[PDB]
Amino acid sequence: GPELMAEPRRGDLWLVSLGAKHRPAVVVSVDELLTGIDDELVVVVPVSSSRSRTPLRPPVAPSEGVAADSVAVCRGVRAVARARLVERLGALKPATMRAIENALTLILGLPT
């Protein structure tokens, strides 16, 4: 059975350490993968406040947890160890998640 209690939840915005230097990111892997252990991989989309916005980089608003208008760099999607997720920053509007899902679908050649 999956652990939902202390674990990041899909659609949340979390602060991620990418060392070893933290960045916010969107949890995009489903919560049924979580077992509450530290080495397991959670798939996230890095959020950038300095890169320009494009269709494959849906915007993320302060109402969703960022300090300033940012973009979700779906091309930068990556699995990270759950231990690099330090604190929950917020939750994304469902429309934002739908835009991230469509961007990922195009990026990964998924049908259709």
Binding site: L18, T35, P46, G76, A81
Partner: protein
């Protein structure tokens, strides 16, 4: 295209028929939906169990430690 038949207890058929008419769908459609849900559950449980078993295997730990070097790419 092709359809078959499954034996159930009559009480379970009644409960499934309730659930089908609650959602406004046929019983066939309901069992398709619930089959896909069960598939997803079994798939994710298979992943969870496999990963926890693989924490003991150090070849796995070495592998993911090596892959973790990419963690900062493109940033």
């Amino acid at each position: 295209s092709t359809s078959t038949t499954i034996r159930v207890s009559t009480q379970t058929r009644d409960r499934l028929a309730a659930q089908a008419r609650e959602r406004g769908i046929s019983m066939s459609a309901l069992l398709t939906e619930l089959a896909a849900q069960a598939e997803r559950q079994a798939i994710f449980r298979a992943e969870r169990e496999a990963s926890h078993a693989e924490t003991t295997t150090q070849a796995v730990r070495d592998e993911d430690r090596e892959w973790e070097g990419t963690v900062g790419d493109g940033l």
